[PDB]
Symmetry: C3
Subunit: 619 residues, 3 copies
């Protein structure tokens, strides 16, 4: 059934419709602004997943690069992966607990006008497809981007407006002005401006929700009745609580635990408990018995934070873990640093590469991820040994890409323009116990100064967590504790992973992963203020190992040199089709580029490389 | 045991041998023509597959590109995938029912002379390897390509002859002149010529079969006795028929069903039936009980078509489903169209790209798929939501490649030479109920006219299906119905998916996927004539939404502009090693190419891009 | 707990430490020499693998190419794969039997100085991580590279020293001077020099082991107690021996068996035996019953070699299998050969490609594998039909890469410098019964001569195997037989696959895969001498099919031609941005490169290609 509604920006209209395209899907929708149009579908199986969790995947795909100008579908980009993840975070929290059904959300860019951004359209598209579908989902959600252009707050800024915005904030909101997801990149802006952007953004999401609710009412939606919701019965939970509460409370009030000892201790309680349940309730099911212990471990864990204002390691609500750092770890590295916060350890390196390396030989491949502004990028890895695990170490890793992008944008505003080399930061998490991406931003800041990049200011980030008590009637929050710098266990037993970074004066990045079906604006405002205190604490300790850029780049650093070649010798110098230069580059790792008729510029990664190149060229 | 036979073309000899190479394989063969030689192997496991179907995979691989001139094995091409699929279709129908054994056919191009095509050799190679092996296979098959060069029918045309042929038809034949597989691309040729090519082709396959039969007789082949053939016992089938026939007949004579309601209705009968079987035959096996219901659903379904000359949706044997179409769906698209036939929906877009984009920066990668003639290509996608399913959306999809290639060749003959841009068609199946590839050809034709490409004539395609009654003695067809424009259900319960496309005056493409062990020439001749009627019907309705190309390209279309740069400024314009031009392209999506000393040509995808480029260049 | 030791070269210090980085891993270590530093981790699960074997994977990764100069981690290279495999072979033999626990070893290049090679550091790193971990592992191992530079034996030669070394030998040693792994590439050097390198290398490994033992003692290591070691009980083995010994002895003393008949015959004994065990020991476990028969089949098999000095096919300890070969298999191939040794068959082809093809258009991709010296490479494939199996035929295959590299280096020293084309050898194993890589070297030598490459001498290789009797007290070898040219079955029931290749006068390559926890130097010296005899025997039979290079390249061979283009016509010749040349290359498979202002060089793969190019250019 064709249906359509327009939502006023008010500056620009959002056109939402459904009922013409892809009508076999459980849900489908198209969202258009200007001449950009996105279709989103939602499909969810009726048979339970072999998984003992909800398998949800979001796939946002584009058909061309560079504002829809360079066709690419005939042949995964960064943009696609990051956009998929943003949509995922905007919808995941609103599925019912126990909904273990294979569910897929796909996005099709029907048309892109190079002016109106399709990413935000797709988030809204997912919301309306789910809303109009028979899939249980506690929405609707509405989403907008907020920019700050020439001093003004602009909703859903055009691509041109974005290029001069000091803010790239995306907000997804649920009814009653609850925040479901916050994603932002900012030019080191004032907390007060950042926070006002959030409130404006939320306002607009509520308008979009109103439009969606109209659409739902016209469509006459009847949700499916899932075969089963896999939540443990109140009986098995109550009993489990009886059996394990005292041991769990003991474990969680023992401050001498570290990550590993604490986990092994709850695991011991789990094994015993889980076997005593198997007997009391022989009527199956191992997975439900497993669910029950997790529910109880979680509740005991949280009740202590709520009742005693103490955390399982003895910290205050606002205390940072101990931090230590070092720069200049290894002599040959252009810059490096080790950043340790509690049992989270990341090693960061900077490497200067040629300006040329920011571009691939193939035009269309280049267009895909584009050329990094300031010729600056950060690559993040989370290898399996960081958690004493075994894992795949090849291929596309979406989480690593997302985390890298987060730490990259945290750092991006302090990077100088017109640096003579490409700046590559590598962040590698060697030990993991919470907020590796925020440690990557910190480590990156230290290594960048070590390397002698004159960054404008140091950068640090931290994760804020959340524990709530909500009435069983409505989902309404009757009490809550914000946690500074959360342990792994506080993330998984907690309600959010609110990662925010910036300088001593402003905010550069935010990624709020919220696991409740939305939270009040007041809670996120407080989270931001609380993180601001911790950030400054991290910066003070960071500034004691290094507080300004090395006054030059290191001895071992790259060098650029200009080489004159007379026409008489060009043909021999370059070789047929430039073969000599290509061979020179492969063999010495230098990068040569012809500047004019007689002039060639040589980038060498080290003085040793240049020497070797000077000898290969000295024929 | 070394054996060899030569089959006369008669113009060119086919040399078939076995017994020297890869003698561990269940079967092996080499086939040579001129100085091109192909080895094919066949391996089939003796233990049943966990699959409840026959797992058959064909892998044809080349070692170089461009007529064997550009080595590539040191590092999946289109050619490889399409060739694999053609071989698969030529052999798959001849395995016995219930043969659930992992089976792999591999092709090795021992040598390629750039004159004689290895693809056809490989099809024959697969046939002789299977024939000489202990693997149950009801062959032999013979295969030839038929060309039409300068007015003459030529069997196995050379590569040079192919380049001037108005026909590229491949036919695989079984004994008694049965057609197993038909694949063809034609320059919009007369039905009568196309049909004569088929008869000539079949004649030649029979000669090849005679040679293969000699080889088999000399070798002394003894087929294995499979552990079991997984066909349901006549007992369980007879009973199931008793239980379900009346409900199934009711469902299949209710014309008010649509795809989904019909499937859910037979599924309800399945659940009930399948539980009543479990009781009557508690002696296992769930899969056999499943097989039995499918056999019965199939037979009931087919008996109605045969006995009453009516189809499950109420159509005549020759009736098209309702069709509707639209062009100009979205303003920013260079061209677009939506084509709907029954519950099959595909969205087609055309996008003009630079001539340069038809070539990759890497020579060897370029050689692999080569440069598309007329700089024209079509990319097809069949996303999972088209059938309300969940699926992988990344990586190589062989079916999508095959379908795209089919719709591409359907359209290729009407495309003008020397168009100023690369023409890319995208076909996306949004709703699926039969013949998405033929809808892609139709949609492509509409979108191409929308975009203002002066194609010589409109193109449409359609699928013909088949239901036969054969005696249980021999496989001989005692009666049959050809079906115009088949539903999904008529494909899977049917005997073929015969997809043919062309213009009002001729044939451009054919892909006959035949599921019986071959069918008579007469049946395919009739299928072609019947499809000709439906094609023209589709064209008449298509011509009512658009019947000629837009008289110009759209407002938003690409533009080419010439830019003069004085030697004095070249070095600054281009930058070191052309860095500026590369950056310009990545940032604006324009494509610049130097024409001479002072002249640069700029391709811009839109006027907006060109403007931006004119400003980046206006420094 | 931070710990560190330095091991003197004595020329260069090896710095080994642990306890600062990645402290969650079961084991971790860093190894440094000069300013190159490598971290290695080891993780092993405590729960048994579903596998009925030890799942061990080694992943060595670099972050840049070309001596650490070209960053690549932002995006598997040959170097990475070959290095991973070398580390794997150095540690795998030292795990306890039955240790079926998922285990992963990862290597992180913390820093690379372009002087000291990280590969050898990583091997040592793996050894110390395992040693310091709670993972059962019978080490330590020590590893060094030995070079021969300007007449002197140099341990851990620098990258500069390696470039002028006539030897690249890596040795991994265990305590009491046992050799665990030998990997070497040599410039056709004297057996006596090669053997002395091994002894020097082993000496140095013992020094490294001493350092590691200190580290272990300081750390206070307590190994885990695995849940279970999956070795069959002596009871089930003793009984199985009773049941099957006589039939197994009969099968293994029947010289009329071939590979397939022998395997089917032991399999028949297995089926019967395995069912009689199920009864005698109904107390499970199928896998243990399976293990037991394999242990017994292995022991019976080996006892015959030991007691009777006869092998299961009737051969002497030192006898080669029958060999036959052929060159010039197919007319269009630049060179080709078929090499058959017993039931091992490989087809080798040579193809001349452009010098340009040794380089990719993308600089950074080129740097990754670099440019092959002498513009020579070998690509090896082991398709599934070679063993009558079904398998994946796409994607990265680590074993194929390793084997190709082995045969490549075997041949590399005899290749002439400054050949006018890239030389590509393809080796394809068509039938497999032992030592396919050594057959690839032999086949490559024949095909190279066939193709008219003036190689300095013929090359052959062969595999030596080993059967030992060791006391049950210590692992000490009380008796042993070296086997010339081993069957598949002698490899899997044997103690090593010692693959060595070279010319009549010297050694070019070695890959010793040893499956015992190290073997005495004396045994490898004897293996080398015994292989020397067989190599020369293979060379004598090879020289009877071809004993010198064809005096010219074949008729069909590539041609280079120089084409003069006047400035007046350049713009038209090359087209915009070189489009014409690119199109010419894609369409004819020729390769054009501009030599100067008016001169273009054309490489054509065949005279036919050149003709076509001369016509495309003759416009």
């Amino acid at each position: 059934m064709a249906s359509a509604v327009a939502v006023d920006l008010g500056n620009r209209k959002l056109e939402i419709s459904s009922g013409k395209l892809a009508r076999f899907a459980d849900g489908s929708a198209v969202v258009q602004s200007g001449d950009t149009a996105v279709m989103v579908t939602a499909v969810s199986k009726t048979k339970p997943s072999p998984s003992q969790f909800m398998p949800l995947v979001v796939d946002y795909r584009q058909k061309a690069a560079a504002a829809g100008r360079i066709p690419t579908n005939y042949l995964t980009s960064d943009k696609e992966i990051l956009t998929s993840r943003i949509i995922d975070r905007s919808i995941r929290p609103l599925f019912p607990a126990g909904y273990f059904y294979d569910t897929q959300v796909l996005c099709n860019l029907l048309a892109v006008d190079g002016v109106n951004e399709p990413d935000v359209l797709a988030i809204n598209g997912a919301s309306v497809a789910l809303s109009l579908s028979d899939i249980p989902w506690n929405g609707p959600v509405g989403a907008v981007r907020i920019g700050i252009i020439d001093g003004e707050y602009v909703v859903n800024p055009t691509r041109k407006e974005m290029s001069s915005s000091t803010l790239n904030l995306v907000v997804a909101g649920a009814p009653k002005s609850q925040i479901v997801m916050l994603e932002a990149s900012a030019e080191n802006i004032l907390q007060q401006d950042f926070c006002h952007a959030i409130k404006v953004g939320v306002k607009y999401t509520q308008q979009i929700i109103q439009g969606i609710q109209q659409l739902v009412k016209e469509t006459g939606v009847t949700k499916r009745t899932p075969q089963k919701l896999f939540t443990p019965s109140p009986e098995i939970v109550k009993y489990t609580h009886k059996l394990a509460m005292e041991r769990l409370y003991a474990v969680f009030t023992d401050y001498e635990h570290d990550k590993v000892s604490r986990d092994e201790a709850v695991n011991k309680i789990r094994l015993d408990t889980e076997e005593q349940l198997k007997e009391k309730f022989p009527e199956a099911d191992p997975y439900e018995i497993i669910e029950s212990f997790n529910v109880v471990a979680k509740e005991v864990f949280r009740s202590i934070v709520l009742n005693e204002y103490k955390r399982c390691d003895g910290r205050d609500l606002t205390s940072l873990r101990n931090v230590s750092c070092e720069v200049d770890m290894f002599k040959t590295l252009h810059g490096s640093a080790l950043f340790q916060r509690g049992q989270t350890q990341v090693l960061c390196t900077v490497t200067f590469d040629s300006l040329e390396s920011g571009i691939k030989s193939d035009q269309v491949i280049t267009a895909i991820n584009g050329i990094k502004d300031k010729n600056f990028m950060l690559h993040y890895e989370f290898p399996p040994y960081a958690t004493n695990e075994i894992g795949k170490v090849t291929g596309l890793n979406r989480r690593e890409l997302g985390h890298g992008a987060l730490a990259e944008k945290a750092l991006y505003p302090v990077i100088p323009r017109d640096f003579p080399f490409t700046i590559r930061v590598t962040s590698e998490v060697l030990e993991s116990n919470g907020s590796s991406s925020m440690a990557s931003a910190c480590g990156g800041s230290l290594a960048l100064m070590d390397s002698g990049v004159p960054i404008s200011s140091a950068v640090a980030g931290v994760a804020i967590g959340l524990v709530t008590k909500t009435d069983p009637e409505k989902g309404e929050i009757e009490d809550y504790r914000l946690l500074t710098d959360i342990l792994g266990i506080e993330d998984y037993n907690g309600d959010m992973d609110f990662k925010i970074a910036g300088t001593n004066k402003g905010i550069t990045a935010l990624q709020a992963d919220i696991k409740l079906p939305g939270i009040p604006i007041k809670i996120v405002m407080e989270a931001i203020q609380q993180a601001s205190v911790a950030k400054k604490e991290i910066l003070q300790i960071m500034n004691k190992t290094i507080s300004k850029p090395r006054a030059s780049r290191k001895e071992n650093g790259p060098v650029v040199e200009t080489v004159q070649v007379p026409l008489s010798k060009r043909a021999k110098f370059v070789g047929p089709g430039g073969y000599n230069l290509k061979k020179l580059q492969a063999e010495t790792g230098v990068t040569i580029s012809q500047v004019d008729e007689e002039t060639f510029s040589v980038f060498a990664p080290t003085p040793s490389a240049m020497h070797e190149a000077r000898d290969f060229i000295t024929e």
